């Protein structure tokens, strides 16, 4: 599955990756606000389309917790049951200045690890998004537990490239959301 996305990515043309990535970037620009309103909007359409079809965005590798979880567009349960749901209204995890991808995954499901261990992720820890365009790396710069009412941490920090691995916390209780935010680092 982390293969059936790797295989599905290789299997698709650079041009198509770019168009989708660029739809991702435009999606991100419109999230964040380089891209025209129309491409922004197309980016929104593509996200929405990715949303509609619960498209796999890729997968987030979190070395710390040995998680390599498929990311799907949308925080729909049907994604959250399968792996990481990219949070709607959130930058697609394609990196970029002023992208903030929020990748939500359950802090565990029955048998299913998912983000159950996100709490072990430690500032400085890295995690990576493999999206259709490749792997990008984040280093957690901020682990935050916030009430689930709090959105502010999930918005694009302009200038910044973040991906917050978002889960519910405390484990099991899920009162709060654990935001493990990675700041884009160079992928090595």
Fold and architecture overview:
The chain has helices at residues 3-10, 14-32, 37-52, 77-80, and strands at residues 56-62, 67-73, 84-86, 99-104, 107-109, 112-114, 126-131, 134-146, 161-169, 176-185. α2 packs across α3 (37-52). The protein has one domain: Sortase (Sortase, Chain: A, Beta Barrel), CATH 2.40.260. It is of the alpha+beta class and 188 residues long. 47% of the residues are buried. The protein has 4 helices and 10 strands. The strands form 2 sheets. An 8-stranded mixed beta barrel has the order 1-2-3-4-9-10-8-7. A two-stranded antiparallel sheet has the order 5-6. It is classed as hydrolase.
Please outline the helices and strands.
Blueprint: H1 3-10, H2 14-32, H3 37-52, E1 56-62, E2 67-73, H4 77-80, E3 84-86, E4 99-104, E5 107-109, E6 112-114, E7 126-131, E8 134-146, E9 161-169, E10 176-185
Parallel strand pairs: 2-3, 4-9
Antiparallel strand pairs: 1-2, 1-7, 3-4, 5-6, 7-8, 8-10, 9-10
PDB class: hydrolase
Keywords: Beta-barrel, Pili biogenesis, hydrolase
Assembly: monomeric
């Amino acid at each position: 599955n982390i293969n059936a996305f790797k295989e599905a990515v290789t299997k698709i043309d650079r041009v198509e990756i770019n168009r989708r990535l660029e739809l991702a970037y435009a999606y991100n620009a419109s999230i964040a606000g380089p891209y025209s309103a129309e491409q922004k909007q197309a980016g929104v359409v593509e996200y929405a389309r990715m949303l509609e079809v619960k498209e796999q965005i890729g997968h987030v590798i979190i070395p710390r917790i040995n998680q390599d979880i498929p990311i799907y567009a949308g925080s729909a349960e049907e994604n959250l049951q399968r792996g990481v749901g990219h949070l709607e209204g959130t930058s697609l995890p394609v990196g970029g200045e002023s992208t903030h991808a929020v990748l939500t995954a359950h802090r565990g499901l029955p048998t299913a690890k998912l983000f159950t261990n996100l709490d072990k992720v430690t500032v400085g820890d890295r995690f990576y998004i493999e999206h259709i365009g490749g792997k990008i790396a984040y280093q957690v710069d901020q682990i935050k537990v916030i009430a689930p009412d709090q959105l502010e941490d999930l918005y694009v920090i302009q200038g910044e490239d973040h991906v917050t691995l978002l889960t519910c916390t405390p484990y099991m209780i899920n009162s709060h959301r654990l935001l493990v935010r990675g700041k884009r680092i160079p992928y090595v």
